[PDB]
């Protein structure tokens, strides 16, 4: 039952730690990406007004 | 027929003894086996942690 414990948990912990690390990257990425969308679609919007 | 009954009775308690010792065997060995599988699990847990 203790091994049953280590197996089951250790697996889903390994698994959610995966997903969690994946979206951690994506989130840090989407901030950088929205910060580039920023200057891009605001230099695009800049000479748009002129 | 009077030796017959005593000859068969030798057979009897002999067979009965055998069976009691057979149970000594299985009763002991099935317990050794549990106390092995359990010793394995004390390791298999550690392995399963590394897994």
- Cα dist from B43 to A7, A10, B11, B35, whole Å: 13, 16, 48, 13
Contacts of B50 in chain A (CB under 8 A): none
Q: For chain B, state the CA radius of gyration.
A: 22
State whether A3 and B45 contact (CB < 8 Å).
yes
DSSP string, A7-33: HHHHHHHHHHHHHHHHHHHHHHHHHHH
Rounded Cα distance between B16 and B8, Å, is 12
- Cα dist from A2 to A48, B31, B46, whole Å: 66, 21, 10
Report the chain A residue with the minimal C-alpha distance to residue B45. A3
Experimental approach was X-ray
Report the chain A residue with the minimal C-alpha distance to residue B49. A6
């Amino acid at each position: 039952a203790m091994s049953m414990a280590v197996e089951s948990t250790g697996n889903a912990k390994a698994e959610a730690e995966s997903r969690a690390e994946a979206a951690r990257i994506e989130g840090e990425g989407s901030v950088l990406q929205a910060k580039l969308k920023a200057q891009a679609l605001a230099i695009e919007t800049e000479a748009e007004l002129e | 027929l009077a030796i017959e009954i005593t000859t068969n009775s030798q057979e009897a308690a002999a067979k009965h003894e055998a069976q009691r010792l057979e149970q000594e065997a299985r009763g002991r060995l099935e317990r050794q086996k549990i106390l092995d599988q359990s010793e394995a699990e004390k390791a298999r847990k550690e392995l399963l942690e590394l897994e």
